[PDB]
Design an enzyme around this catalytic site. Structure first.
Site: not given
Ligand SMILES: Cc1cc2nc3c(=O)[nH]c(=O)nc-3n(C[C@H](O)[C@H](O)[C@H](O)COP(=O)(O)OP(=O)(O)OC[C@H]3O[C@@H](n4cnc5c(N)ncnc54)[C@H](O)[C@@H]3O)c2cc1C
Ligand SMILES: O=C(O)[C@@H]1CCCO1
Length: 281
Positions: A82, A119, A150, A171, A214, A275, A279
């Site tokens: 970051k 990031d 994003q 990403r 995910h 965070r 979530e």
């Molecule tokens: C590898 C990676 C790197 C990322 N880097 C960034 C970044 O640099 N900047 C940024 O703004 N965002 C980033 N994100 C996105 C931010 O972290 C997401 O908005 C968040 O991960 C939402 O999860 P999702 O896309 O799985 O979907 P969602 O629609 O939120 O969730 C989908 C499903 O995934 C599962 N899930 C997701 N999150 C969780 C949790 N916390 N606990 C339990 N189950 C969960 C559940 O089954 C959920 O229903 C990143 C995400 C990933 C995976």
């Molecule tokens: O910091 C966070 O919550 C997200 C997920 C990983 C990178 O940016």
């Protein structure tokens, strides 16, 4: 207090689902465990919005120590930073301190054939991060530095197109921060559709794409898109956070997709872990 020890340990046990541990050693061990299961690692030292220029530079030095340790263990350095942890927005001797620390980090990772992802933080940092990304690609090459877009932001599709001349590694994520309707789509159906547009446009452009989610509905649609467009399984990867949908991580690797897990560690884990809690489904 001695009375609070049990509660402190219980909170850490909760966080240990999402955070490898507090040391470089714990992070390296977690990456080795992922690799034994056919999954790649993406290391991150936890911490953000660091106020002191001295502490920002110390933080960058700690990221360099991580890269050295990964390399010495036989792990190709792949690290996410970051830029607010290393001084973005602060001037030191007429240059942005985030940019000069990022140069040192990327130079070290590149010596060892590695890669750094910048990031994406909250919306106030997008312009400067994309400017600095373009500068850094010019200095080190698109093979060695990448960034993140994003899907919840209205501006993201235009940003992705603006970057195509760099052939960048990006990403695609939904978005981690609290953002108002003037900046981000309020309807989750729009966030999810825009996510597909970002991934699909990046793949059609021939750029390396990290499908970081995910969400199984999205993952299945990406598998479908790649099949229909004849895209090789070496041309993109799925990415997930440590501890989230481990079953999918393993299944995708067994099907021959690339999977790389975001693997955070360190003592300053409260922000990232908060965070993950917010979530929770
Ligand atoms: C590898 C990676 C790197 C990322 N880097 C960034 C970044 O640099 N900047 C940024 O703004 N965002 C980033 N994100 C996105 C931010 O972290 C997401 O908005 C968040 O991960 C939402 O999860 P999702 O896309 O799985 O979907 P969602 O629609 O939120 O969730 C989908 C499903 O995934 C599962 N899930 C997701 N999150 C969780 C949790 N916390 N606990 C339990 N189950 C969960 C559940 O089954 C959920 O229903 C990143 C995400 C990933 C995976
Ligand atoms: O910091 C966070 O919550 C997200 C997920 C990983 C990178 O940016």
């Amino acid at each position: 207090p001695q009375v609070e020890q049990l509660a402190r340990q219980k909170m850490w046990n909760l966080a240990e689902r999402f955070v490898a541990g507090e040391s470089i050693e714990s992070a390296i061990q977690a990456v080795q465990a992922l690799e034994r299961d056919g999954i790649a690692g993406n290391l991150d030292l936890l911490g953000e919005f660091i106020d002191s220029p001295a502490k920002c530079t110390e933080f960058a030095d700690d990221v360099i120590k991580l890269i050295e340790a990964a390399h010495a263990a036989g792990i190709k350095p792949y690290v996410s930073i970051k830029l607010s942890s290393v001084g973005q927005g602060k001037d030191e001797n007429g240059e942005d301190l985030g940019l000069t620390n990022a140069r040192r980090i990327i130079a070290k990772a590149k010596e060892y054939g590695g890669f750094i992802c910048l990031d994406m933080e909250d919306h106030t940092r997008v312009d400067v991060t994309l400017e600095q990304f373009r500068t850094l690609v010019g200095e080190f090459g698109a093979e060695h530095v990448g960034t993140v877009l994003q899907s919840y932001l209205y501006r993201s599709l235009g940003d992705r197109a603006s970057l195509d001349d760099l052939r960048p590694n990006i990403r695609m994520v939904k978005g981690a921060y609290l953002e108002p309707a003037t900046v981000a789509y309020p309807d989750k159906a729009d966030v999810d559709q825009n996510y597909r547009r970002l991934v699909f446009q990046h793949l059609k452009a021939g750029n390396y794409t990290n499908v970081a989610t995910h969400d199984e509905r999205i993952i299945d649609d990406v598998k479908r898109f790649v099949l229909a467009h004849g895209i090789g399984k070496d041309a993109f990867e799925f990415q997930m956070l440590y501890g989230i949908r481990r079953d999918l991580q393993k299944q995708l690797a067994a099907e021959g997709y690339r999977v790389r897990v975001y693997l955070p560690y360190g003592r300053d884990w409260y922000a990232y872990f908060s965070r993950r809690i917010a979530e929770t489904p």
